[PDB]
């Protein structure tokens, strides 16, 4: 149990993490499938107990890195993988190895996923919550107003293929 192992039951075979659960099959039901006809749970033929078929940890191995001219230090992300089945920061998208989690929120430079971003700062790679901009408490009232005293002619570059 609790291990990614190949299984060969009475009628069904496959590969996945064998683990128990609180489900209850009927006295005659020997196996179980999800909505899409994929085996999600089984009953052990020997011991009358219910066993969920959790899939083996899978996902893409993404590499977080700065520019080559900046530094050669990098970080790895195992998408949808806990850190116990790969100092190290567990993200909602996966386990981020090689990045120190920083409480201070900075601008998103290297978007990882699920609000998490990274950047090369004082040097090593850091992880932080994605900052959505600088806070600006606009002074509002029923009598105050801001009128612009000067302006700047800005030329914006809009590229459209």
């Amino acid at each position: 149990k609790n291990k990614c192992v190949n299984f060969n039951f009475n009628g069904l075979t496959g590969t996945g993490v064998l683990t128990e659960s609180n489900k209850k099959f009927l006295p005659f039901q020997q196996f179980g499938r999800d909505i899409a006809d994929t085996t999600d749970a089984v009953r052990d033929p020997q011991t009358l107990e219910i066993l969920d078929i959790t899939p083996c940890s899978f996902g893409g191995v993404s590499v977080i890195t700065p520019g080559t001219n900046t530094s050669n230090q990098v970080a790895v992300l195992y998408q949808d993988v806990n850190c116990t089945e790969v100092n190290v920061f567990q993200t909602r998208a996966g386990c981020l190895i090689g990045a120190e989690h920083v409480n201070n929120s900075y601008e998103c430079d290297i978007p990882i996923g699920a609000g998490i971003c990274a950047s090369y700062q004082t040097q090593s790679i850091i992880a932080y919550t994605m900052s959505l901009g600088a806070e600006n408490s606009v002074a509002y009232s029923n009598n105050s107003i801001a009128i612009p005293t000067n302006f700047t002619i800005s030329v914006t570059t809009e590229i459209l293929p």
Partner: protein
């Protein structure tokens, strides 16, 4: 196979790698050992008789 930095160079086909995130490979936990399960062997044939 040296480091994750080199994996990006082989995946992107470029020595210089820009600041960002790139998918280089896939993680797959392989099965440790095949687990065979079958009901207990009851109703034995009368070969011993």
């Amino acid at each position: 196979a040296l480091d994750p930095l080199s994996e990006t160079k082989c995946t992107l086909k470029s020595f210089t790698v820009e600041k960002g995130i790139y998918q280089t490979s896939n993680f797959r936990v392989q099965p440790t050992e095949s687990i065979v399960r079958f009901p207990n062997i009851t109703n034995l044939c009368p070969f011993g008789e």
